Amino acid sequence: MREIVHIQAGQCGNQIGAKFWEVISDEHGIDPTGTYHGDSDLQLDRISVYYNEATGGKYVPRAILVDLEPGTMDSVRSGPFGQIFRPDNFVFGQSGAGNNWAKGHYTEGAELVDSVLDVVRKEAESCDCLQGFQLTHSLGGGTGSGMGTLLISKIREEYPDRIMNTFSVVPSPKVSDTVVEPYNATLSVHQLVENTDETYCIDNEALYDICFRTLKLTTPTYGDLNHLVSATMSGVTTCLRFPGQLNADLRKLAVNMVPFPRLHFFMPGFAPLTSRGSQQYRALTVPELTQQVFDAKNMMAACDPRHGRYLTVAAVFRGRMSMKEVDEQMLNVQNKNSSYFVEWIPNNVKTAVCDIPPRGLKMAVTFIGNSTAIQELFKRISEQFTAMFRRKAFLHWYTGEGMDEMEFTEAESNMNDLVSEYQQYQDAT
Amino acid sequence: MREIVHIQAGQCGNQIGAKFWEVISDEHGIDPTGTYHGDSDLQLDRISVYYNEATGGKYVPRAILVDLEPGTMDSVRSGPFGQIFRPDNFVFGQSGAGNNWAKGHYTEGAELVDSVLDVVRKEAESCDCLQGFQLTHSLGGGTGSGMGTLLISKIREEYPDRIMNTFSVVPSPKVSDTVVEPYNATLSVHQLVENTDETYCIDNEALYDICFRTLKLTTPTYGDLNHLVSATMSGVTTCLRFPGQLNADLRKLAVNMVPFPRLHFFMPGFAPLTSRGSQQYRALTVPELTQQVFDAKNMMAACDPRHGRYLTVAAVFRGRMSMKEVDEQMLNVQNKNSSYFVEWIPNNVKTAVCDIPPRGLKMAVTFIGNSTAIQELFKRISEQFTAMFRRKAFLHWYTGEGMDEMEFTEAESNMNDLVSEYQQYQDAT
Amino acid sequence: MRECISIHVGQAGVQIGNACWELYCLEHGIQPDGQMPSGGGDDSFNTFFSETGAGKHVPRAVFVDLEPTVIDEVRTGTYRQLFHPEQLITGKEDAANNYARGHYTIGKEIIDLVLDRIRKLADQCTGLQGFLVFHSFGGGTGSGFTSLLMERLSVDYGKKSKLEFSIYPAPQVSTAVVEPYNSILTTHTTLEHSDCAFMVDNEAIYDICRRNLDIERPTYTNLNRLISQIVSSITASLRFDGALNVDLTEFQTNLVPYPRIHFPLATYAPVISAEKAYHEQLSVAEITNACFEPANQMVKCDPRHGKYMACCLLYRGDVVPKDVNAAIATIKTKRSIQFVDWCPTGFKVGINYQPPTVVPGGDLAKVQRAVCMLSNTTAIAEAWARLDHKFDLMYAKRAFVHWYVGEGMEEGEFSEAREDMAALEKDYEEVGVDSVE
Amino acid sequence: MRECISIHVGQAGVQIGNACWELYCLEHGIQPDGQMPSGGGDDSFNTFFSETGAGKHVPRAVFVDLEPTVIDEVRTGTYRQLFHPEQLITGKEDAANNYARGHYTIGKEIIDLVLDRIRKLADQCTGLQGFLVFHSFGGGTGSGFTSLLMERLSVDYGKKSKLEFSIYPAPQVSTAVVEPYNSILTTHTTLEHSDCAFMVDNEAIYDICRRNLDIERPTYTNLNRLISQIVSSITASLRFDGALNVDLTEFQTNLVPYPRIHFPLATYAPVISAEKAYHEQLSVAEITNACFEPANQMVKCDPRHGKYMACCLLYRGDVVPKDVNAAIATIKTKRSIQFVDWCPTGFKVGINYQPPTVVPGGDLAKVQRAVCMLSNTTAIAEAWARLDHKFDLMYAKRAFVHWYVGEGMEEGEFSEAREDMAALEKDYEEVGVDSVE
Ligand SMILES: Nc1nc2c(ncn2[C@@H]2O[C@H](COP(=O)(O)OP(=O)(O)OP(=O)(O)O)[C@@H](O)[C@H]2O)c(=O)[nH]1
Ligand SMILES: Nc1nc2c(ncn2[C@@H]2O[C@H](COP(=O)(O)OP(=O)(O)OP(=O)(O)O)[C@@H](O)[C@H]2O)c(=O)[nH]1
Ligand SMILES: Nc1nc2c(ncn2[C@@H]2O[C@H](COP(=O)(O)OP(=O)(O)O)[C@@H](O)[C@H]2O)c(=O)[nH]1
Ligand SMILES: Nc1nc2c(ncn2[C@@H]2O[C@H](COP(=O)(O)OP(=O)(O)O)[C@@H](O)[C@H]2O)c(=O)[nH]1
Ligand SMILES: [Mg+2]
Ligand SMILES: [Mg+2]
């Protein structure tokens, strides 16, 4: 019951999905071969949420792997957790999208989307009761953005009732691994804002600063960044998988997080994230974790929440803690940060608690903040988009793959409407 | 010869009736099994007054146990004397009356009154000579008030000639066992005033005080209060049950006591009630008993006799007691307290004497008084009734069970008439 | 003989039901397997439990939740053998803290099965007194399905009593953003059908635990234990024999003056740690005084901000009627505690012989005396003013209305519920007026 | 040769009858079994007893009471064998101190049986002197039933004598509130049908017992012993032989000057303790003077407040005619006492040889001389003035009239009784005034 169908598109989405499934199988006690060797019965009690029980006790993940180029999926299949997935779910084309949203959406999308949707349908019909979907993708990429938008639209067509989450590695202010990132990102959020129900915005620079300031990693590879993102995924999706004193499912998170249908862009976070040495000095308590997640430098998106205001806040705790102090620490947070919470929301916090902590830690907490400071990121992306679009620097690549410039202007107009909506409630009184 | 049919309605009435039957069977030497083991032949001579002689020397009480809830009756049946009653007489309804006079009178009353009247009829035909009835109940309750009113009305309909006696537990100023005591009490007295011939007003606060001042009991439970009430009952009904040097049957008491057909609400009392330490110091004499019963502090109603004047007083004496020192002490009482006696009754005292004392005491006296200080109690109850009825605080519960507000106004009007009827003889000269 | 059907809706309702049936099993001596290993305890036992010819005893309980996780916790716990497997009703998907989802869409699928099980239990019941419902206003499943079930049960069994044990939304602390919406809508639907709803507050119980019990790490196990103690004190009159037995019909008759003013405030004394239990006497006067203090109320509402209109005290254990009478007279005489002039007799008294039982591993001290105080008072008008103000703040901008509109209800429902709660607050301030002439 | 019938009505009548028949059995030597274990005693025995061929002797008694308890006490007492089992006639329910009940409603069932048994008793008499009646004005059964019985006997027998021994209501104390109503109604009915009724007062006998016999807490027993001594002195002339014999017809002729003024006052002497009997001689002059003191009257009425109009003295024992003649001349000569001028000879004398017999365990001292003084005098006018005032105070407000009206009589009867009593006291003050010439 309460199944979830996971999709991963793009190199970024595929790698984050690989680390996510590594973490999930690790904390459920499933070997890479798929045979369960875990100790707790609670791991098997809710294993149907993400896994299908194949014959002989082998647990197949309910995962769909997508990429228009086969290199990263071949790497995943060659990795230690290659055997865990079903071979049939590996769907790919023979040519990548480069970094062209047009190529990913229209040309290669029109070929591959049918196959991946029959795969998604085969997984969906197996569910006893299907809860919402999840997607991992990068807005800056071509393949991830285009295929993710196309799947989001068509899966909302086929399953309009279901919840539908996404985990987007949004572009960054300073670091940019692709020159056309503004175009790809703008078209991506233009498609996503109409269709999705929840989107959590990850920022690679923010992950780098978190690793440097808190974890003190001198050489943070993408493995550590994906480890943190997988930690956030396991934190948010814990209430379906484990018992808890306050259970908060994904639809509950949607109802608590989304005031208006288009403001569903969240800034996630996690605690504790201390280094090796700092664990001995720091006594981990619920006050310490609450102050850590509400510290701005801990946020996994580059935007400073102090620049904006919090519309809604959610905290999924994991481990064992008295909830009196969870509530009182949340109220001390609200009193100290009363300037940073919108008045028209009387209470912004959605608490949830789960009994079982992750990776043998005594405690953990996962933060989700719907705040108006994300308007700064959208302003930045729209400004870069307009700066390039004034000269139409790279529009011929997108026009060659079929689309019109009218689409680009429509996406810009919808971004302008989105930032106007975000600023309206900051200005409201 | 000269039988009495006993009824006990409500929790209060049932518990007092249980203790009354303990006292009666104890002084008649009947075991809880119903077998006789007393020493005196006079116990068997008048045992027919309260008991029916079953086969094999077993004496069943002439008692009828009514309650719309089961708990008190089940407690009685499981009690030590539960064997003594006839099982058929355990008539009981399927749902309680709450504390609602309307529920007790109309809704469940129409159901159960048929069965209880069949039981009353079979007992009455079992009696060769039927003297009056004796009901025990609480005015403040729902079950006791409603069932008592309906039973009293129907028994007066079918048996108009025979006397009716009731032992009613009334509220006080400083206590409240239920919130709707004024409503239940007022409706009950309105129904009782035309039907009953005698009503003995017991008050819980007065017995609590009596236990504190005279008996010095640190922890007087309801058992001691029921002990005192049963003492008064055995005192008043002693003349039918034993030979006596000046007999006074309860028809004689009613004829002496009710000057006008509505003023039949009396004030009981008893003496001696000394504590364990005090009997050694005190010398039990008829002057001591007379001064004790005529003491205000001894009275079992909270109203002060000194505030009002007296109408008629009844002293039923028990034990080997002189019939001259009683008379001289009543003369001293009348001379000293002449200001407290109405002049238009020239002699207010009805004396009775019985040879057999209770419990092995050498001497005892039971006091009845028709003092006009009960107008203060009726004034208090009517004032509380009007205070609630001004806002119609709880009226919709009574109206749901069928009755109208006109009944409430009629009861208030009749209570006003009763208080005026008590005040006019105070004003008379 | 006299039966009460317990119903437990939502996570809060079922978890409190776990604690409550644990306490009932401990009190009656029933093992978690259902068998009694063992005179006066028999009928006391028969009230809440159904006999089976094999000697096993089945609770008269219906556990309902639209998500299966918590009821599966019940089905895996120590009391799995105790409950009827069929009565544990589980929906497929959660209500997502959405009143509209829990009331209309997901509610209409499962309401028929829930009513069928309730009908079968009532058919078995020889003498039914009423229903005991446990839920929370903030929860979607709780609020919506409780409203639906309450209207259906009013239509079917409207003659009999219906008693809700609802968790009021706390003043400062909260666990949900849409909690004022859920609470306003469910109070609007519940005001007509409820007979009397006893109030509970997590923040108040947290403060009670921290002050009296000296528990610096209070869990919802502790909170549910206290709520279990409250309900056991309430139902001990029905179960065990006593000097003065309070039933549900007279609870209703005493506590509820008007149809729409039926919200008493729960309270237990002595709440005290075993460490400090040795020093204090804990007499009837002390526990009675502790009941009326503002600090020990289970709702964060100062009674000094209002006036009492109906108090009901339920003493259990080694308790004397003279002692309780003197205590109530003292409390009436005090002027810091105020009562409405139009209710001269503001106290209902109940006594019974059975003292409370301390759960193993519990935080409360063993006591030969206990009292449960239930007070209908006007202080909670302030709390409804707070909740209505929060509702106004969110609904003025349509903060979360689109979810409820998607799950099948109109804005007319929101406006009508707000108007009804405004009428309720008015009624409260009206009856708070002192009489004139 | 000459016979009397003793009818004992009400609790007072039957209890005094128990004492009386105890005294007669002691005087005649009859055992409580009824057998004579043993010359002049035989004819004296024959007057009050009916002899049977088996040697047993039955009293010429009819015990009537509408309540069964006192007659059952008689049926369990030592004299159960003495009385005829049928003649102890019992009704089913008490009169409740209600003249209306006893006269009209309850008495009408049993009056026929009582009259039939009185007829059967009268049939076995050669010459019936008359009837003796015992009752109390205050009692409901006594008042109503003696009124009904007196009118029925006056209709049936008529010319034969009819003597009552009634307990006059005490002046200060009273054991019944409705005593004035009962008393007024019964004496209203008694005035037409009676021949001579002898008043007795409980308070007066208490004062006598305290003052003379030197006892402190007397009881009815002693009172009934004194009343038994009175009737034994009255009837000893009929039973035993004597120097001057007197009959009931001559009692009427002497004591009754006018038909309605037939209420003398009982008195016995010497009432004296056994301890003080040694010091005093108790001669004829001493006992004769003791008769006429106000202190030793058995009705609380000072004779100095009025005038005697018929005195009748009954000496018994060692008495000579000259001693009594000198004493009566002395008492006539005294000025303290006063007699009506229109009765020059106010003394009737009777003497007989048999002295009184002291009962075992009694307080009266053994004496060879005794005297019983019966005095018709105007001092009872004061007592009836008091009783009329009491009746007026009660009846002005209709104090207890509804109880009497329920049992079938009108207020016109009350007014008629009061008018008759007004006429009685007018007659008393009329005869109390001296002649015009
Ligand atoms: N005292 C107490 N309160 C609880 C408990 N569990 C949940 N709550 C309260 O319930 C509120 C949240 O609503 P829930 O009752 O958990 O939600 P629900 O009724 O299951 O409905 P859904 O959320 O849609 O599943 C919180 O504010 C808690 O105060 C409990 O075990 N004890
Ligand atoms: N001397 C004397 N007086 C008695 C005796 N018994 C009763 N009395 C008087 O009778 C008065 C009351 O009337 P009762 O004779 O007792 O009543 P009753 O004749 O039995 O008629 P009821 O009213 O039916 O009982 C009291 O004031 C007593 O003084 C007795 O045994 N001896
Ligand atoms: N967190 C994370 N981000 C990645 C990873 N690999 C690539 N990215 C981000 O993804 C962006 C490239 O888009 P990508 O999805 O690879 O392009 P695509 O081939 O069209 O799907 C870059 O800006 C990277 O910051 C990874 O392993 N982890
Ligand atoms: N004297 C005495 N009074 C009692 C006893 N039990 C209850 N009461 C009184 O009865 C009143 C309650 O009314 P009750 O008859 O129990 O309500 P019911 O259930 O509708 O009949 C309270 O005011 C008590 O004072 C008892 O054992 N003895
Ligand atoms: Mg839930
Ligand atoms: Mg009598």
Enter the resolution in angstroms.
Answer: 2.9
Atom 26 (ligand 2): residue with closest C-alpha? D175
Are the beta carbons of B146 and B115 closer than 8 angstroms?
no
Label the pairing between strands C49-51 and C57-59: antiparallel
- Whether D347 and D313 have beta carbons less than 8 Å apart is answered as yes
Contact (Cβ atoms closer than 8 angstroms) between residue C235 and residue C47: yes
> H/E element holding D7?
strand D3-9
The full set of domain ranges for chain A reads 1-259, 260-373, 374-429
Four-point Cα dihedral C26, C27, C33, C36, nearest 10: 130
CA B120 → CA A74, B134, B143, distances in Å?
A: 97, 12, 18
Q: Which of B377, B281, B296 is nearest to B333 (CA)?
A: B296
Query: CA gyration radius for chain D?
Result: 21
DSSP state string for D241-257 = --SB---HHHHHHHH-S
| Alpha carbon distance D167, D220 (integer Å) | 12
Task: Give CA–CA dist B80/B75, Å, rounded.
Answer: 10
DSSP letter string over A207-232?
A: HHHHIIIII--SS--HHHHHHHHHHH
Q: How far is the CA of C162 from the centre of ligand 2 (A)?
A: 64
Terminal CA-to-CA distance of chain D, rounded, Å? Answer: 46
Min Cα separation A326/chain C (Å): 10
**A269 burial level (CB within 10 Å; 0-12, 13-18, 19+):** buried
**C122 and chain B: CB distance < 8 Å anywhere?**
no
b/e per residue, D66-80, with b = 16+ CB within 10 A?
bbbbbbbbbeeeebe
Which residues, 6 or more positions from B208, have their beta carbon under 8 angstroms from its beta carbon?
B220, B225, C321, C322, C325
Q: Is the link from the previous residue into B160 a cis peptide, with omega within 30 of 0?
A: no
The set of residues, in sequence order, having a beta carbon less than 8 Å from that of D371 and lying 6+ positions away, is D233, D268, D269, D270, D284, D287, D288, D291, D313, D314, D315, D316
Domain A374-429, second-level architecture? Orthogonal Bundle (1.10)
Please list, residue by residue across C351-380, b when 16 or more beta carbons sit within 10 angstroms of its beta carbon and e when fewer do: bbebbbbbbeebbbbebebbbbbbbbbbbb
Q: What are the tokens at D381? A: 């006018």
- DSSP character string of A303-318: S-GGGS-EEEEEEEEE
Mutate to test the interface with C, among A322, A324, A325 (most CBs of C within 10 A): A324
Distance C9 CA to ligand 5 centre (A): 9
Q: Measured between alpha carbons, how far is residue B25 from residues A376, A400, B60 in Å?
A: 94, 113, 10
Task: Say how far apart CA C222 and CA C138 lie, in whole Å.
Answer: 20
Query: Chain B neighbours among D 288-317 (CB < 8 Å)?
Result: none
Answer whether D9's CB lies under 8 Å from D134's CB. Answer: yes
Look at residue A418 and give its three-state secondary structure: helix
Sorted by sequence, the CB contacts under 8 Å of residue C304 that are 6+ apart come out as: C294, C336, C338, C379
Burial per residue of A173-194, b for 16 or more beta-carbon CB atoms within 10 angstroms, e otherwise: eeeeebebbbbbbbbbbbbbbe
User: In angstroms, what CA-CA distances link A184 with A70, A101, A141?
Assistant: 21, 5, 7
Residue D282: exposure state from Cβ atoms within 10 A (0-12, 13-18, ≥19): middle
Residues B31-48: b if buried by 16+ CB within 10 A, e if exposed: beebebebeeebbbbbbb
CA nearest neighbour of B69 among B103, B89, B92? B92
- What is the Cα–Cα distance from D141 to D89, expressed in whole angstroms? 13
List the domains of chain C with CATH numbers: 1-264 (3.40.50.1440), 265-379 (3.30.1330.20), 380-437 (1.10.287.600)
Q: Which residues contact C54 (CB under 8 A, 6 or more apart)?
A: none
Give the span between the Cα atoms of B208 and B215, in whole angstroms.
Answer: 10
Q: Which of C127, C310, C342 sits opposite B390 (nearest CB)?
A: C342
User: Are the CB atoms for A247 and C69 separated by under 8 Å?
Assistant: yes
| Residue D364 and residue D233 in contact, taking contact as beta carbons nearer than 8 Å | no
Which among D98, D140, D177 is the nearest to B347, CB-wise?
A: D177
Helix axes D179-193, D411-431, angle to 10 degrees: 70
Residue C382 one-letter amino acid: E
DSSP three-state, residue D167: strand
Per the entry, the structure determination technique was cryo-EM
D177, B322: Cβ pair inside 8 Å?
no
Compute the distance between CA of residue A50 and CA of residue A30 in angstroms, rounded to an integer. 12
Reading the block at residue D142, the tokens are 């006594």
Which 8-state DSSP code applies to residue D79? G
- Number of CB pairs, chain B paired with chain C, less than 8 A apart: 124
H or E segment and range at residue B168: strand B164-170
- Yes or no: say if D418 and D388 are a contact pair by the CB < 8 Å rule: yes
* List of long-range contacts for D203-210, beta carbons under 8 Å, 24+ apart: D203/B327, D203/D170, D203/D171, D203/D172, D203/D173, D203/D300, D204/D170, D204/D297, D204/D298, D204/D299, D204/D300, D205/D298, D206/B324, D206/B327, D207/D295, D207/D300, D208/D271, D208/D295, D208/D296, D208/D298, D209/B324, D209/D363
At position A35, the amino acid (one-letter code) is T
Per-residue CA distances from C271 to C205, C214, C265 (Å): 10, 10, 16
CB D329 within 8 A of CB D284: no
Dihedral of CA atoms A172, A173, A177, A182 in degrees, nearest 10, equals 90
Q: Is the peptide bond before B272 cis (omega within 30 degrees of 0)?
A: yes
- Of ligand 3's listed atoms, the one at least distance from the Cα of A171 is 23
D186 annotated ligand-binding residue: no
Q: Nearest to residue C234, comparing CAs of C281, C298, C301?
A: C298
Tell me the one-letter amino acid at D104. Answer: Y
User: What residues of C are annotated to the active site?
Assistant: 250
Subunits next to D (3 or more Cβ pairs <8 Å) are B
Cα D219 to Cα B293: distance, rounded to the nearest angstrom: 22
Name where chain D breaks: residue before each gap, C-N > 2.5 Å: 38
Cβ-Cβ contacts under 8 Å between A and C: the total is 108
Distance CA A203, CA D420 (A): 125
Touching pair A, D by Cβ (3+ pairs < 8 Å): no
Rounded-to-integer distance, Cα D77 and Cα D96, Å: 25
Residues in a beta bridge with B319: B363
Beta strands (DSSP E) in D153-267 are 161-167, 196-200
The token duo for A285 is 């308590």
Residues 6+ positions from C310 with CB-CB distance below 8 Å: B179, C254, C255, C256, C257, C264, C343, C346, C348, C375, C376
- Residue list for the binding site of C for GTP: 10-12, 15, 67, 95, 136, 139-142, 175, 179, 202, 220, 224, 248
- 3-class secondary structure per residue, chain C: CEEEEEEEEHHHHHHHHHHHHHHHHHHHCCCCCCCCCCCCHHHHHHHHEEECCCCCEEECEEEEECCCHHHHHHHHCCCCCCCCCCCCEECCCCCCCCHHHHHHHHHHHHHHHHHHHHHHHHHHCCEEEEEEEEEECCCHHHHHHHHHHHHHHHHHHCCCEEEEEEECCCCCCCCCCCHHHHHHHHHHHHHHHCCEEEEECHHHHHHHHHHCCCCCCCCHHHHHHHHHHHHHHHHHHHHCCCCECCCHHHHHHHHCCCCCCCCCECCEECCCCHHHHCCCCCCHHHHHHHHCCCCCCCCCCCHHHCCEEEEEEEEEECCCHHHHHHHHHHHHHCCCCCECCCCCCCEEEEEECCCCCCCCCCCCCCCCEEEEEEEEECCHHHHHHHHHHHHHHHHCCCCCHHHHHHCCCCHHHHHHHHHHHHHHHHHHHHHCCCCCC
Question: Residue C281 — φ and ψ, nearest 5°?
Answer: -75, -45
Alpha-carbon distance of B95 to B143, in angstroms, equals 10
Q: Of residues D73, D151, D203, D250, which has the active-site annotation?
A: D250
Residue B254: enclosing H or E segment and its boundaries?
helix B250-257
∠ at Cα C310 (C306, C314), nearest 5°?
120
> Would you list the DSSP string of A326-387?
HHHHHHHHHHHTGGGB-TTSS--EEEEEESSPSTT-SEEEEEEEEETTHHHHHHHHHHHHHH
Q: Which residues contact C5 (CB under 8 A, 6 or more apart)?
A: C60, C61, C62, C118, C121, C122, C125, C128, C130, C131, C132
Strand partners, A182: none
Distance, CA C141 to ligand 5 centroid (Å)? Answer: 6
Amino acid at the residue C184: I
Nearest to C12 by CA among C48, C64, C51, C57: C64
Q: How far apart are CA B116 and CA B5, in angstroms?
A: 12
CA distance C49 to C5: 9
Q: C220-239 and C41-48 helices cross at what angle (nearest 10)?
A: 120
- Chains touching C (at least 3 CB pairs under 8 A) are A, B
CA-to-CA distance for B210 and B212, rounded, in angstroms?
5
CA-based R_g, chain C, Å: 21
DSSP class of residue B298 equals T
In this structure, are residues A265 and A312 in contact, taking their beta carbons and an 8 Å threshold? no
Minimum-distance CB partner of B71 among C241, C343, C344: C241
Ligand nearest to the CA of A100: 3
d(CA A395, CA A408): 9
Burial (CB count within 10 angstroms: exposed 0-12, middle 13-18, buried 19+), residue A296: middle
Helices (H) and strands (E) in chain B, counts: 17, 12
Test mutation, C44, C246, C250, C341, chain B, max B CBs within 10 A? C250
Answer positive or negative: Cα dihedral of B144, B146, B147, B151: positive
Beta strands B363-369 and B313-319, pairing class? antiparallel
Instruction: Determine the Cα–Cα distance for residues B87 and B109; give it in Å rounded to an integer.
Output: 21
Token pair in block for residue B49: 């007054």
CA-closest candidate to residue D395, choices D381, D405, D408: D405
CA D149 to chain centroid:
16
Q: B201 CA to chain C: closest CA distance, Å?
A: 19
The pair phi, psi for residue D90, each rounded to 5°, is -130, 130
CA D383 – CA D377 distance, rounded (Å)? 12
The 10 Å Cβ neighbour count of residue C26 is 17
Q: Is residue A412 a contact partner of residue A187, using CB atoms and an 8 Å limit? A: no
CB of B271 closer than 8 Å to CB of B293: yes
- Closest CA in chain B for residue C350: B177
Q: How far apart are CA B22 and CA B29, in angstroms?
A: 10
Domains B1-259 and B374-429 belong to one CATH topology: no
Distance between CA A89 and CA D105 in Å, rounded? 111
Angstroms from C122 CA to nearest CA on chain B: 14
Q: Measuring CA to CA, how many Å separate B239 from each of B242, B251, B352?
A: 6, 11, 8
Comparing CB atoms, the residue among B256, B324, B328 nearest residue D176 is B256
CA terminus-to-terminus distance, chain A: 43
The letter for the amino acid at B408 is F
Reference B252, options C7, D69, C78, A348; nearest CA is: D69
Count CB neighbours of D431 within 10 A.
17
Return the structure tokens found at D399: 């104090």
Q: Which of C312, C17, C12 is nearest to C166 (CA)?
A: C12
D68: nearest Cα among B6, B247, B255: B247
Decide if domain A1-259 falls under CATH 3.40.1280.10: no
Contacts with C389 from chain A: Cβ below 8 Å: 346
Which residues touch B63 (CB under 8 Å, ≥6 apart)?
B6, B7, B8, B17, B21, B85, B89
- A260-373 in CATH: which number? 3.30.1330.20
* 3-class secondary-structure state, position B259: coil
Give the residue from C42, C244, C253 with the most B CB atoms within 10 Å of its CB, the best one to mutate: C253
Three-state SS at D128: strand
* Six token digits for residue D193: 């049908």
Give the length of chain C.
437
Handedness of CA B215, B221, B223, B226 (dihedral sign): positive
Radius of gyration of chain B (CA): 21
Q: How far is the C-alpha of A72 from the C-alpha of A79, rounded, in Å?
A: 10
| Cα maximum dimension of chain B | 61
Measure Cα distances from D425 to C86, C92, D300, D422 in Å.
97, 106, 17, 5
Round to whole Å and give the CA distance between D428 and D187: 15
